[PDB]
């Protein structure tokens, strides 16, 4: 098919759902890209109160959390001087119900 009613090509994104003609097959009106909007917004949880007091015990994994997240943010000057890469990606893993989310 080709270009919409009079809509810019940039607005006609990849994966974006579109209404087309019943029999003359051509874009008319853009439609919401899927239904990722609104569903997702339910799922989002924002900065909970959860602190290490509410985490039962402390282990080495938590000490390895602290380095990655806390240290480059408070002072990226330290990471430069060392000339190491600054950690900013982490993979957390183990058995479920460990409390992986609680520490995050």
């Amino acid at each position: 098919v080709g270009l919409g009613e009079r809509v810019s090509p940039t607005d006609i994104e990849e994966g974006m759902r579109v209404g087309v003609d019943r029999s003359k097959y051509n874009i008319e009106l853009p439609l919401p890209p899927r239904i990722d909007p609104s569903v997702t917004m339910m799922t989002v949880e924002e900065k909970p109160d959860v602190t290490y007091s509410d985490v039962g015990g402390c282990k080495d994994q938590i000490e390895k959390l602290r380095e990655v997240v806390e240290l480059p943010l408070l002072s990226p000057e330290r990471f430069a001087t060392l000339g190491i890469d600054p950690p900013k990606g982490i993979l957390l893993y183990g058995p479920p119900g460990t409390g992986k989310t609680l520490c995050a």
Binding site: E67, T81, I84
Partner: protein, 108 residues
């Protein structure tokens, strides 16, 4: 593909896949180099002694050596030094090792 003993006998004919080149291990020559290039990225100090490290490490591949140096920076950061110490590399060696780091006696 990792050893030819595992590979099947009919596709391992000479002149089929041309030369067959075996990789000999690091020999305390190549080790020192391999480390040197990995530390070039991080800050370079004379506190570090590359030759000593080459001697410590025995039967370690390129991959393993690389891990020894990456582990050193996490340790230096943890200490909070501006610059990594030779001391930290030694500690990375026994962390990359399968066995648990130096601890008091309790069975041996």
């Amino acid at each position: 593909t990792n050893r030819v003993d595992v590979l099947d006998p009919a596709l391992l004919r000479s002149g089929r896949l041309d030369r067959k080149i075996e990789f000999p291990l690091p020999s305390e020559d190549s080790r020192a180099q391999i480390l040197q290039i990995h530390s070039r990225k991080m800050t370079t100090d004379d506190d570090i002694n590359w030759q000593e490290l080459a001697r410590s490490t025995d039967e370690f591949n390129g991959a393993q050596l690389k891990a020894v140096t990456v582990e050193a920076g996490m340790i230096a950061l943890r200490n909070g030094q501006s610059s990594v110490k030779h001391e930290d590399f030694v500690e990375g060696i026994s962390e990359v090792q399968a066995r648990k780091s130096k601890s008091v006696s309790f069975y041996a």
